[PDB]
Amino acid sequence: EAKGEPDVTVNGKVLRMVQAVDGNWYGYFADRDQAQIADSTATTADSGLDFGVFCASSSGTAALGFSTTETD
Amino acid sequence: ANANLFVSAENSQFDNYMSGPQVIEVVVIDSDINDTDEAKGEPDVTVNGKVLRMVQAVDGNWYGYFADRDQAQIADSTATTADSGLDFGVFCASSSGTAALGFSTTETDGIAIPITIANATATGNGTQTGSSSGGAITTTCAANTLDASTANGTINVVREAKDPVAASGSVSVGQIGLKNGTANSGPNWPFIQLYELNPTGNVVVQYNKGGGVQSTTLTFDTVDQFAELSLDRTVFPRVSQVHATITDLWLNIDPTDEDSWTFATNTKNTTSSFNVDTFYQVFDENGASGGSALTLRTTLSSLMCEDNCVLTLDVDAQSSGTPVVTIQDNGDSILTQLNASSNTNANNASAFGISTETAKLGTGSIPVTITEQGPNSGVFGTYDESDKSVLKITDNAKRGTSASLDYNETPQTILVGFSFASIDIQPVTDEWTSGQEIPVVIVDADQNKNSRADEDLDLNNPDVTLIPAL
Amino acid sequence: TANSGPNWPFIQLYELNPTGNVVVQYNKGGGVQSTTLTFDTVDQFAELSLDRTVFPRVSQVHATITDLWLNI
Amino acid sequence: DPTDEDSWTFATNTKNTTSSFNVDTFYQVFDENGASGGSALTLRTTLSSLMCEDNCVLTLDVDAQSSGTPVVTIQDNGDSILTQLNASSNTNANNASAFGISTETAKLGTGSIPVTITEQGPNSGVFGTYDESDKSVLKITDNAK
Amino acid sequence: ANANLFVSAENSQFDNYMSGPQVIEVVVIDSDINDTDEAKGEPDVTVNGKVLRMVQAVDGNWYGYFADRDQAQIADSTATTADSGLDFGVFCASSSGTAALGFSTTETDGIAIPITIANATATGNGTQTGSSSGGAITTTCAANTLDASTANGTINVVREAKDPVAASGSVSVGQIGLKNG
């Protein structure tokens, strides 16, 4: 069923959650500065503290398919 | 106390008051109607007896935004350009909801939708700017006005509205029939429904549900008694960051977003054309611009601002030629030292300004930006997430010389001084024999420059001026 | 897909205040559930423990590291 | 109404000695929002059969001593639509008989002091002349003695 | 007190008295029957023993509106015009519920549906204003009575009823078979 996303916030900012097959809504967040610094060290893909590819908050609807503006 | 209905203005800290052009978010977080795939019905939510149209979002919560009609019109009267300042978008008649939004909105006093007008007729299209004197609106809007829109999303008072439920099968957009459901960038959502409220008169938001209705009471009155500003300390060292905590309900215009205000606080810039002023949404909550700066000094009188919406700063109370307080760029600001001459330095606060808005926020004028600590806490702070304040004390400040900061017409003095230290060595026993680490205790309030973090001494840190040595 | 696709998982980036609390809020019908964290250096929680005082001829050396930072 | 707050409009002027006029109670002339709730319909000759035991009729007298200066007056608010029928400058707002409902002047015209009450909640059962903005229907006249 | 049954007249302030043309709402809020996508069973509710048919709303709660027959007839008598005053709508006999609403309502003394009559037959169409002195209801209603109505929603004593559950899959309208929801 298309139930409603839980309205969970950290420091007020909304944190989008994706449902899993275990019926539990999951959401992962981290500090922006620390994550950028860590991904700086990962000079190669899929190794070390590689956070993936950073994208702007306005790009979530285009890439992920849902609004994520309130995130940094 | 309420189980499902939550109102933004509901705040025991500020005693449920509301004032100014505030847009009030009404959310109905109810588990019985949280699904978005079935053709569910709209919950019966009314304020002062008038029905408040609710839109279901992707999070399963029904949303609805309302504000005072007169205050909203007066605020939008200051929106010289679209999507800037206190812009509420474009107003329309209460009978135009069916033609524009697709659903009836007769019971309201006018709707503010983020459309723009290409054929600006005097009868068939609303007012982009709105009457500066307030009063009822009779301009109607129709479908052709929607089809003739050249830019959607002019509303700047509700910037983080949730996405309306997408239409599918037996469910329409928002379950009530919005024509365009693109949130924060479309012509329909978000939209504010304007209501007639009376200053000093209570506002009652009612949610009607089986088993017992839920009602909340808000007071629509000037809130100067709660506006306050506090300093983290009393005495301050030479380079300590100046932290300002502005507990003001009026400044929380956007309920679903952190609000940013810009002030021209230079109290002694005797230029005739310059005056102390306030600006809205010059910078985003991330310090990424967001729009132009618009005048509000001559409008605050009509915006229920009895000495609680202006900021002015005194940098030298004794006029001794030694300025105390200066400003710098932060993570949520785009400040720039326009006067980059090598003769002066960062201590000359009048050298700082904003490049994009040099007309009023140019050199001098002490452009000061404040950001809300939270989206709806109603408490604003100069210090950013990195703890770099907007205000700092000059390094060459003379002892005893103090500056004063003014908010709510209640001056706050920023004194400059120190404290007597006492370094003590406490051995674990009566003899300090070899191979015995014993604690060294130093009590010095001068080095405690932050009351919300831990300060560690460091030779590599020039800010840490004094380090014990043996 | 679980961990090989371009969308899930993803981390949302949030500015946090060092030495300041991080509050996670969950707005649900009937009451709000809050969990407040702390974004601060955890060196005071790091310690290494050994399973014996004196180590015999061919004993194993078991080291236990209790470090919050290393749990990325 | 168990699912909405009810609104009642009355005809409380006890000295309107016109033979046709009677002290009458009207149901839902103005909705809870203050709009036109429909037409005004007679209820005086029916309250006996509606189990009303002398608790369904409101009567008002703007001056008990008949001194020529009325004590209380009436005024429009958010929960009703009250308009000046006798707009002549010879009379002011202090005349309680100059107020009436324009759309239903047959039984709520000039005179016949229309007092309106709204329920404080959908099912609370408590009614109040004052609206949500603390602006009452009944008001003390300006030049009272 | 009760945990799943909510009646509009449960007020210890007024000693749970009910009088006059009062319409008394009965609400069932149960965790076992509030699934709107499943055809769960109707709650078995009786007022003075008589069964009280309930329609489920989008919030998963079952609603039933009842009032005294004589009082409602007297109050509707004053409603000379439709959808104004103490208008209870159109009175139909108990035996006409199946044709008019889509389900049996025999145990009730009568039902008041929000329609209007366009062919005021003395037998086949129900009364529009109701007897001044009250009394028994005998006039009936049918499907042609619904289709011939020139205006729907003439009840003014219950103005803010919740939206019935829409028909989808195996679930009917209101889970009991309303014709127009």
TrEMBL record, chain C:
It comes from Nitrosopumilus maritimus (strain SCM1). This is Uncharacterized protein. The lineage of its organism: Archaea, Nitrososphaerota, Nitrososphaeria, Nitrosopumilales, Nitrosopumilaceae.
UniProtKB/TrEMBL annotation, chain E:
The chain holds residues 37 to 217 of 1734 of the full protein. Disulfide bonds join 92-141. This is Uncharacterized protein. It comes from the Archaea.
